[PDB]
Amino acid sequence: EEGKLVIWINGDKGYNGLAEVGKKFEKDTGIKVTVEHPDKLEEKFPQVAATGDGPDIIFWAHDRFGGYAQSGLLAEITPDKAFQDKLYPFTWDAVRYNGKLIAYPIAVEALSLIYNKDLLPNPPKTWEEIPALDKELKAKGKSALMFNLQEPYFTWPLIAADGGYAFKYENGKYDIKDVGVDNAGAKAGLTFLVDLIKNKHMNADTDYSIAEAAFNKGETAMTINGPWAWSNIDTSKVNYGVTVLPTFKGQPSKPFVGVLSAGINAASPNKELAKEFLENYLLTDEGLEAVNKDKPLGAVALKSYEEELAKDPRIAATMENAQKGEIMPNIPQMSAFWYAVRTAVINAASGRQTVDEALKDAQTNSSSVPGRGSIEGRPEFAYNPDTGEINWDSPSLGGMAHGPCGEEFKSAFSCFVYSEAEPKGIDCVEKFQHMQDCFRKYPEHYAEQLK
Numbered sequence: 254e255e256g257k258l259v260i261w262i263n264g265d266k267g268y269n270g271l272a273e274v275g276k277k278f279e280k281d282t283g284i285k286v287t288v289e290h291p292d293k294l295e296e297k298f299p300q301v302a303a304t305g306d307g308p309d310i311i312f313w314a315h316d317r318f319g320g321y322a323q324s325g326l327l328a329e330i331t332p333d334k335a336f337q338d339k340l341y342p343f344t345w346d347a348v349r350y351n352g353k354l355i356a357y358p359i360a361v362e363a364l365s366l367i368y369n370k371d372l373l374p375n376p377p378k379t380w381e382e383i384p385a386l387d388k389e390l391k392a393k394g395k396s397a398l399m400f401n402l403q404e405p406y407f408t409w410p411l412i413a414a415d416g417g418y419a420f421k422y423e424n425g426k427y428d429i430k431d432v433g434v435d436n437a438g439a440k441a442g443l444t445f446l447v448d449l450i451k452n453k454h455m456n457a458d459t460d461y462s463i464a465e466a467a468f469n470k471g472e473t474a475m476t477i478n479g480p481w482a483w484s485n486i487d488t489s490k491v492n493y494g495v496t497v498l499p500t501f502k503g504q505p506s507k508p509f510v511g512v513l514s515a516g517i518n519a520a521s522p523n524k525e526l527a528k529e530f531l532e533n534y535l536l537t538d539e540g541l542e543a544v545n546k547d548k549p550l551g552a553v554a555l556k557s558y559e560e561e562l563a564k565d566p567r568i569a570a571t572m573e574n575a576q577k578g579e580i581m582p583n584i585p586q587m588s589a590f591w592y593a594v595r596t597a598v599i600n601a602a603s604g605r606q607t608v609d610e611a612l613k614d615a616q617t618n619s620s621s622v623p624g625r626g627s628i629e630g631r632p633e634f635a636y637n638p639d640t641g642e643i644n645w646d647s648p649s650l651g652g653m654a655h656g657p658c659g660e661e662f663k664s665a666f667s668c669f670v671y672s673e674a675e676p677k678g679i680d681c682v683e684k685f686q687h688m689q690d691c692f693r694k695y696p697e698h699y700a701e702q703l704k
């Protein structure tokens with residue numbers, strides 16, 4: 254805290270460059286800027302924020318900011334009208350939640366099909382043609398590709414190609430009631446991916462690392478990653494090339510576009526110095542170059558910097574892909590969506606489940622769940638975090654724990670209160686549904702249905 258700045262940024266981004274622009278700020282304001290790069294920063298921020306700590310400003314793809322805002326963890330930004338002109342308007346929209354601009358857009362990210370130019374003169378024009386390309390390829394001790402399968406971000410570009418989609422853009426907003434992770438398309442993709450993990454084409458444990466080392470070492474002719482990774486493929490030169498993502502079942506592979514944004518903590522002692530830095534030092538050709546030269550940002554939201562940088566081919570490819578797909582939504586429900594698909598891909602791809610069984614759940618874990626009212630909020634005062642005990646008689650439960658559905662309530666309430674999932678209670682859905690099904694057998698008993 255205090256009168257000096259501290260900021261969080263993901264470990265794969267150029268935080269050394271960010272700290273570099275911080276030494277400049279310091280040198281011109283006498284305010285030491287400290288950059289950090291925690292693990293599960295996206296999940297760790299909303300946790301550390303409530304308990305006094307947390308950075309003065311946090312960096313992350315915009316899709317995660319709707320939630321922070323909802324919880325009142327972020328302070329609305331106040332960029333000049335003139336300063337809003339220096340940034341593309343679409344990057345500003347991806348950062349406006351409920352009419353309030355809640356974060357500064359930095360750069361738009363989009364996964365691309367990276368291919369070893371020395372191995373593959375002509376990259377796979379098709380996704381389903383990878384099996385016949387990894388064929389004549391394995392015939393040398395090399396696979397066709399290796400990307401992080403532990404993160405739904407990298408696998409989703411496929412799953413959505415033939416119709417898979419998160420939250421439909423119904424009316425003027427994202428309809429949390431309309432989810433498409435369990436339709437024919439989503440299954441056509443997930444089927445193929447686990448159809449490539451079965452044909453031995455690629456193990457189902459591959460990491461971001463295990464997948465980066467496998468390309469940085471001429472191990473595999475391809476991989477799927479973003480702008481921030483280009484820096485290591487150049488360091489340990491592998492004569493790579495960045496192009497459009499392979500098409501699946503016809504239509505293009507559509508990646509979920511992300512806009513790296515800087516958010517100002519609501520409880521940031523330095524909320525004006527945050528502005529000075531982000532607005533006058535980072536979001537400038539010099540400032541963005543300092544970060545970029547460390548770990549590519551690829552396609553920045555600064556009109557000036559971008560225009561004369563769309564010249565680069567890899568950047569043009571990144572953008573072409575960003576066009577094939579859709580920009581991620583910022584709503585609070587994204588956190589859960591990502592949970593559902595992360596889990597669904599981890600099971601349907603490890604044999605733990607089948608595509609049908611896995612996505613069926615993904616759809617239920619992404620969709621809205623009932624009960625929330627009679628459990629989350631005031632009712633939680635029954636739970637004593639110290640002992641971890643529940644007072645089923647505390648008037649805060651409204652008596653819910655004692656009646657026709659007393660057992661069902663108890664099961665759902667305790668699960669949410671003992672939950673350590675992300676977001677909390679996302680593992681208690683079925684129990685919240687089971688409880689809801691019980692409210693319906695005694696409708697005269699409940700008004701927890703009045704809606």
Ligand SMILES: OC[C@H]1O[C@H](O[C@H]2[C@H](O)[C@@H](O)[C@@H](O)O[C@@H]2CO)[C@H](O)[C@@H](O)[C@@H]1O
Nearest residue numbers: 295314316317362404405406407511591
């Ligand atoms: O996993 C590395 C990847 O993380 C981010 O994508 C996240 C997204 O921001 C989260 O809100 C959630 O959806 O999980 C995604 C990964 O599955 C970054 O935006 C991306 O740049 C980074 O490479």
